[PDB]
Amino acid sequence: SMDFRIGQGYDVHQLVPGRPLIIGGVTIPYERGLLGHSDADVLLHAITDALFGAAALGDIGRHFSDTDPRFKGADSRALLRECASRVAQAGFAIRNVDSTIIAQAPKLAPHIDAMRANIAADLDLPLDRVNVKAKTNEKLGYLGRGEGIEAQAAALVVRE
Amino acid sequence: SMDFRIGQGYDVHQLVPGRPLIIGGVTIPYERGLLGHSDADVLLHAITDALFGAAALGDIGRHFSDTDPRFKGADSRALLRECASRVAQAGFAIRNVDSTIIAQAPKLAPHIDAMRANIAADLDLPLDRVNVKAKTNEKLGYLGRGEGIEAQAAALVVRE
Amino acid sequence: SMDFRIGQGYDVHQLVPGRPLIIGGVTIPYERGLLGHSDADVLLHAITDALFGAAALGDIGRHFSDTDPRFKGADSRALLRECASRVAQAGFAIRNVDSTIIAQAPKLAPHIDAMRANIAADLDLPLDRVNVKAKTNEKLGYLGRGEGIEAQAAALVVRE
Numbered sequence: 001s002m003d004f005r006i007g008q009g010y011d012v013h014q015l016v017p018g019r020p021l022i023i024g025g026v027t028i029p030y031e032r033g034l035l036g037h038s039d040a041d042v043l044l045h046a047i048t049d050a051l052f053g054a055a056a057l058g059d060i061g062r063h064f065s066d067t068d069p070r071f072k073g074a075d076s077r078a079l080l081r082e083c084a085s086r087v088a089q090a091g092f093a094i095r096n097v098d099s100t101i102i103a104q105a106p107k108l109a110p111h112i113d114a115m116r117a118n119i120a121a122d123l124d125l126p127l128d129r130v131n132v133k134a135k136t137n138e139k140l141g142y143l144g145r146g147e148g149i150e151a152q153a154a155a156l157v158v159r160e
Numbered sequence: 161s162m163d164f165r166i167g168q169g170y171d172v173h174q175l176v177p178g179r180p181l182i183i184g185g186v187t188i189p190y191e192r193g194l195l196g197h198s199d200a201d202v203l204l205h206a207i208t209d210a211l212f213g214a215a216a217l218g219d220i221g222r223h224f225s226d227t228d229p230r231f232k233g234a235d236s237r238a239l240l241r242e243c244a245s246r247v248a249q250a251g252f253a254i255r256n257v258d259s260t261i262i263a264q265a266p267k268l269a270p271h272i273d274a275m276r277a278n279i280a281a282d283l284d285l286p287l288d289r290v291n292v293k294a295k296t297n298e299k300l301g302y303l304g305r306g307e308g309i310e311a312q313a314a315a316l317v318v319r320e
Numbered sequence: 321s322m323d324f325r326i327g328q329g330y331d332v333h334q335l336v337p338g339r340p341l342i343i344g345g346v347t348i349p350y351e352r353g354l355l356g357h358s359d360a361d362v363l364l365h366a367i368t369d370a371l372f373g374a375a376a377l378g379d380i381g382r383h384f385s386d387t388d389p390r391f392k393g394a395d396s397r398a399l400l401r402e403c404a405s406r407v408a409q410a411g412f413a414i415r416n417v418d419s420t421i422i423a424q425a426p427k428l429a430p431h432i433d434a435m436r437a438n439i440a441a442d443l444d445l446p447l448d449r450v451n452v453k454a455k456t457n458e459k460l461g462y463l464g465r466g467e468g469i470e471a472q473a474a475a476l477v478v479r480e
């Protein structure tokens with residue numbers, strides 16, 4: 001009941017024209033979107049990595065081919081749910097998730113609660129155990145220039 | 161007694177002429193200082209965000225910046241104290257904080273213990289539950305060119 | 321048995337021709353290697369810092385100076401083992417480590433189990449409490465251009 005473990009995750013994707021902008025499962029109106037083989041949901045990927053890492057199950061690349069042509073455009077919420085299923089199968093219950101999105105644009109405040117609800121649904125958690133934070137990079141670097149979006153995540157689990 | 165939660169925080173600010181350099185509440189001699197509407201204490205901001213995240217209370221931007229009369233002109237220590245108040249209000253106790261400052265200059269080593277003492281006082285924690293680390297970015301990127309200073313933080317809390 | 325603490329770590333080193341590439345104690349064939357005073361093992365440095373952080377013992381630069389004769393010529397595994405000894409003597413047992421390497425190249429997945437094996441040995445941990453993840457920076461910034469490699473780490477300990 002006290003075999004706790006922590007995990008941490010990081011991800012970044014380029015912002016490009018002609019792609020949907022999907023963050024935290026939310027399709028956000030914007031002239032650009034994130035580039036990747038999947039739907040490129042940088043927030044869900046970072047959380048997925050934190051969960052695999054807390055369970056010592058490797059990482060998102062190990063579990064989900066980023067090159068399989070059948071999976072082009074994959075829904076990263078389906079990947080997050082399969083991650084959670086494998087973490088559970090390994091014997092772990094999720095206690096909480098925290099995360100940060102770093103972007104110059106668009107404004108993410110109107111979308112954060114929806115992201116939180118998506119993640120909570122996918123992890124079978126109440127809202128009070130999931131947190132999504134959003135901020136800019138204060139004009140510095142490629143994030144300041146709006147060339148990509150970063151996400152960070154932390155997860156606490158317990159082996160039952 | 162076992163409802164633990166983790167949070168993670170990140171912040172960065174530009175280094176600019178004509179501002180005092182204040183990190184972890186410590187005024188450090190230096191020809192530049194951090195830019196922000198606040199006093200731009202990047203370390204206290206990262207710790208603040210980690211604490212809000214561990215309590216699933218959102219983030220520093222949702223708590224502090226509507227030109228709220230109580231917080232205009234507030235320094236980052238007052239805001240850290242208020243964050244800790246709101247964490248307690250939600251029924252959480254803080255168990256520990258860890259953090260890293262990334263800066264090419266100036267030398268922060270002589271100031272680390274004063275930062276730790278300031279954070280401990282603001283969070284009503286013993287010293288042995290607060291840690292601050294500092295390193296350079298090996299001359300890489302905007303941190304490496306001395307254009308900004310980054311802070312990272314992790315916090316463990318428990319819902320009593 | 322319930323005095324849990326969390327720590328976090330970060331490191332980066334430049335990647336240029338002329339030095340071997342050593343990560344997690346593994347020598348990896350590559351046309352470039354990491355620059356630093358010791359062996360520049362960016363992954364072990366980040367994990368070392370997360371462990372000192374969780375124990376609130378400061379950081380790797382305060383424990384292992386480049387000037388101290390005791391550690392002249394010590395490689396990063398020797399430093400990691402001494403870190404673990406100090407964490408133990410401060411009264412903490414390590415519960416788990418998670419980490420991420422960010423590099424555009426080479427492919428690190430073939431070397432992950434070797435890194436995990438080295439880390440678990442140095443920390444006297446079962447293999448299923450040590451995790452290493454690896455991903456690219458999607459061609460963004462100095463990491464995306466192959467000009468350096470970053471590592472992030474998270475550690476959970478408990479005071480015994």
Ligand SMILES: CC(C)NC(=O)Nc1nnc(S(N)(=O)=O)s1
Nearest residue numbers: 038045061064065066071074455
């Ligand atoms: C296309 C889907 C099924 N597979 C997928 O998305 N795999 C990934 N592997 N690493 C990633 S990362 N580095 O962007 O978090 S996403």
Ligand SMILES: CC(C)NC(=O)Nc1nnc(S(N)(=O)=O)s1
Nearest residue numbers: 135171198205220221224225231
């Ligand atoms: C001036 C005070 C009252 N308000 C304030 O400091 N608000 C912030 N919002 N985000 C921040 S961050 N992203 O630089 O940590 S600081």
Ligand SMILES: CC(C)NC(=O)Nc1nnc(S(N)(=O)=O)s1
Nearest residue numbers: 295331358365380381384385391
């Ligand atoms: C040369 C050995 C004995 N000492 C050593 O390597 N100390 C460090 N201090 N900071 C580091 S960092 N910033 O690259 O993680 S490594």
Ligand SMILES: [Zn+2]
Nearest residue numbers: 011040042045
């Ligand atoms: Zn991704």
Ligand SMILES: [Zn+2]
Nearest residue numbers: 171200202205
């Ligand atoms: Zn800030």
Ligand SMILES: [Zn+2]
Nearest residue numbers: 331360362365
């Ligand atoms: Zn290093």
